[PDB]
A paper describes a structure:
By comparing anomalous peak heights or anomalous difference Fourier maps, specific elements can be identified and placed in the crystal structure. In this paper we used this method on three test crystals, [name], thermolysin and lysosyme, to identify zinc, calcium and chloride ions, respectively.
The anomalous peaks overlay with the previously modelled zinc ions. In the data set collected below the absorption edge, the theoretical zinc f′′ decreases to the level of sulfur (f′′ = 0.4 and 0.5 e− for sulfur and zinc, respectively), and both anomalous scatterers are visible in the anomalous difference Fourier maps. For each zinc-binding site, the anomalous peak heights decrease threefold between the data sets collected above and below the Zn K edge, confirming the presence of zinc. To illustrate the procedure, f′′ was refined with phenix.refine for the three collected [name] data sets. These data sets were initially collected to perform a three-wavelength multiple anomalous dispersion (MAD) experiment at peak (λ = 1.2853 Å), inflection (λ = 1.2874 Å) and remote (λ = 1.3051 Å) wavelengths. As the data sets were collected near the Zn K edge, significant variations in f′′ were observed over a short wavelength range. Nevertheless, the f′′ refinement successfully identified these variations, yielding values closely matching the measured values and confirming the validity of this approach.
Numbering used by the authors: 19 to 147, 297 to 329, 336 to 339
The structure:
């Protein structure tokens, strides 16, 4: 006899169905609590936390480590790429030379003195007489960084040949 869907309570007569969180589901019934996406089609896993079943992006958004821009002071979502320097994070558009206002990009040479950024061609000689050191702009990284998989629950797609992997 058919399995019951944990999402709707109904028997699952569909040819293809999902297994996740120890339960069977109609694919349409396994949805992100926040954005309603159909988890089994958009990706390979779900996240469980605080009564919710979430897609990866909303899990990051609601529970990942957000930060704040050292230049403008405003929060940075976990999902946003940031520039890094001397232990600070910056909005990409905030990562600019304090003298000429050029936006600094990966591979650029730059100087840092007491929070102020300077491009290679605006070396602040007057200030320098630790800022003498030339640094290389790194690639942008995600604000949230790496996170553990302890709330991740893989989704398995199954075929009922009326149960086999898909
Ligand atoms: Zn259902
Ligand atoms: Zn979502
Ligand atoms: Zn900023
Ligand atoms: Zn400059």
């Amino acid at each position: 006899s058919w399995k019951r869907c944990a999402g709707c309570g109904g028997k699952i007569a569909d040819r293809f169905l999902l297994y996740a969180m120890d339960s069977y589901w109609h694919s349409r019934c396994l949805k992100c609590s926040s954005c309603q996406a159909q988890l089994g089609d958009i990706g390979t896993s779900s996240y469980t936390k605080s009564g919710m079943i979430l897609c990866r992006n909303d899990y990051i958004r609601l529970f990942g480590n957000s930060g704040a821009c050292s230049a403008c002071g405003q929060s940075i979502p976990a999902s946003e790429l940031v520039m890094r320097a001397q232990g600070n994070v910056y909005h990409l558009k905030c990562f600019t030379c304090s003298t000429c206002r050029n936006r600094l990009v990966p591979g650029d040479r730059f100087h840092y003195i007491n929070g102020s950024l300077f491009c290679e061609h605006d070396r602040p000689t007057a200030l320098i007489n630790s800022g003498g050191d030339v640094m290389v702009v790194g690639e942008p990284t995600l604000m949230g960084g790496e996170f553990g998989d302890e709330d991740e629950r893989l989704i398995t797609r199954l075929e009922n040949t009326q149960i086999d992997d898909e």
